[PDB]
Design a protein around this ligand. Structure first.
Ligand SMILES: *[C@@H]1O[C@H](CO)[C@@H](O[C@@H]2O[C@H](CO)[C@@H](O[C@@H]3O[C@H](CO)[C@@H](O[C@H]4O[C@H](CO)[C@@H](O)[C@H](O)[C@@H]4O)[C@H](O)[C@@H]3O)[C@H](O)[C@H]2NC(C)=O)[C@H](O)[C@H]1NC(C)=O
Ligand SMILES: *[C@@H]1O[C@H](CO)[C@@H](O[C@@H]2O[C@H](CO)[C@@H](O[C@H]3O[C@H](CO)[C@@H](O[C@@H]4O[C@H](CO)[C@@H](O)[C@H](O)[C@@H]4O)[C@H](O)[C@@H]3O)[C@H](O)[C@H]2NC(C)=O)[C@H](O)[C@H]1NC(C)=O
Ligand SMILES: *[C@@H]1O[C@H](CO)[C@@H](O[C@@H]2O[C@H](CO)[C@@H](O)[C@H](O)[C@H]2NC(C)=O)[C@H](O)[C@H]1NC(C)=O
Ligand SMILES: OC[C@H]1O[C@](O)(CO)[C@@H](O)[C@@H]1O
Ligand SMILES: [Fe+3]
Ligand SMILES: [Zn+2]
Ligand SMILES: [Zn+2]
Length: 341
């Protein structure tokens, strides 16, 4: 009845889960997969219960029947009376970041540049940017737009993986999990920070969180916000402070999904779980904090205040919103109902 099997993607997420498992008294157990799609398959088979996913994957998991349970909620200023769990989710800003020193580089001069994406099939890292690009370009050849990139998930032998590093030994090149040096939000930003790429498609919180001595990580402590700029769709360039007036789209928050016949139990165990290891949980700072991993966004983004109820018991198409759902469909015509498994 009351035991949840979380699905960890890769070795770094597995050790944070095992610690979560340790401290839960087996109330939460861990399964491990090499990629997100594999974690979705384990959840379908019934061998795993849930995992926190980006909107890009929610579309996939949704076509295969999985349903959104709880969502991630970060620090907010509007809706200050409401409790984090009952408080609506605001979504997040997908942006195109570049180096200030890289003058002349604008949304219209991206052709043949070098790119950094969080990973294939994700919202801000792939779906939004490329969807805009296919559209504007009137072509599906998105694999020939940038000279080279690091889009975790693409074929290792392709130019879309050309800029990925792999792990400490150089193995697992381009794999879509934390083992890839430039995987995910942080990885992609680093990919720009180290000047490996000309532009990185992440979200706005990513810039703030890793600049101005906010990260302390070898490659980030000396990074200053003013050395970065945002590419707007009007061909303009703006400071990272003008995010609301220069973003590619507003992405729906990452959320925990599960098979519909388990959602009620996955939802209950988690709410309780976060009462213990959440932001102001009984044992978070002292023993274990679910929403902390040191700027590595393991299992959940570090900026999460809490996981929140949904309200309107949404289906995946509703949670993601018709806006974004069409975006993905139009782009997928390039690579129409079914679910890839
Ligand atoms: C890439 O280009 C594709 C081709 O143009 C885009 O696909 C189309 O996307 C549009 C919008 O995303 C879809 O059209 C409509 O959008 C309207 C706006 O929401 C909807 O109607 C609404 O308008 C009235 C206005 O009076 C409002 O009052 C009302 O409240 C409502 O919100 C329509 O219902 C409809 O969706 C269209 O379906 C897509 N067309 C095709 C051929 O698929 C695609 O989005 C672009 N991709 C990206 C990422 O930008
Ligand atoms: C781009 O990305 C950044 C980070 O993702 C976005 O925002 C940040 O703004 C948040 C607020 O929306 C910040 O959290 C808040 O944290 C403190 C305390 O927790 C706030 O102090 C305040 O406390 C007094 C007490 O009365 C009150 O006035 C309020 O309660 C108020 O909350 C704090 O000022 C801040 O708002 C966070 O600090 C900040 N991130 C960083 C690293 O600076 C940013 O909004 C975003 N751009 C856009 C367009 O969203
Ligand atoms: C394990 O999960 C359960 C369920 O949330 C918690 O254990 C129990 O404690 C509460 C309050 O005393 C009871 O309502 C349950 O029936 C208890 N279960 C039993 C019989 O042991 C517990 O908080 C979780 N354990 C840890 C370590 O967090
Ligand atoms: O950011 C916009 C997103 O948030 C909502 O308005 C509310 O939860 C969603 O339907 C949409 O996807
Ligand atoms: Fe995302
Ligand atoms: Zn907007
Ligand atoms: Zn509904």
């Amino acid at each position: 009845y009351t035991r949840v099997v979380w699905c960890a993607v890769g070795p770094e997420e597995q050790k944070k889960c095992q610690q979560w498992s340790q401290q839960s008294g087996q109330n939460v157990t861990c399964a491990t997969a090499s990629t997100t799609d594999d974690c979705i398959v384990l959840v379908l088979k019934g061998e795993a219960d849930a995992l926190n996913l980006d909107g890009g994957y929610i579309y996939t998991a949704g076509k295969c029947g999985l349903v959104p349970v709880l969502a991630e909620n970060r620090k907010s200023s509007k809706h200050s009376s409401l409790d984090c769990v009952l408080r609506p989710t605001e979504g997040y800003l997908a942006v195109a970041v570049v180096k200030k020193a890289n003058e002349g580089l604008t949304w219209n001069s991206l052709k043949d540049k070098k790119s950094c994406h969080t990973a294939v099939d994700r919202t801000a890292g792939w779906n939004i940017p490329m969807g805009l690009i296919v559209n504007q370009t009137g072509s599906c050849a998105f694999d020939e737009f940038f000279s080279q990139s690091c889009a975790p998930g693409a074929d290792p032998k392709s130019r879309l993986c050309a800029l990925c590093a792999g792990d400490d030994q150089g193995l697992d090149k381009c794999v879509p999990n934390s083992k890839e040096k430039y995987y995910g939000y942080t990885g992609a930003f680093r990919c720009l920070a180290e000047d490996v790429g000309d532009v990185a498609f992440v979200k706005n919180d990513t810039v703030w969180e890793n600049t101005n001595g906010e990260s302390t990580a070898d490659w980030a402590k000396n990074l200053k916000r003013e050395d970065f700029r945002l590419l707007c769709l009007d061909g303009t360039r703006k400071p990272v402070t003008e995010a609301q007036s220069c973003h590619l789209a507003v992405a729906p928050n990452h959320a925990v999904v599960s098979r519909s016949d388990r959602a009620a139990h996955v939802e209950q165990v988690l709410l309780h779980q976060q009462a213990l290891f959440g932001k102001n949980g009984k044992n978070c700072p002292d023993k274990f904090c679910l929403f902390k991993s040191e700027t590595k966004n393991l299992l959940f983004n570090d900026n999460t205040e809490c996981l929140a109820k949904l309200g309107g018991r949404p289906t995946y198409e509703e949670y993601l919103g018709t806006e974004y759902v069409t975006a993905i469909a139009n782009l997928k015509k390039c690579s129409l109902e079914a679910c890839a498994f």
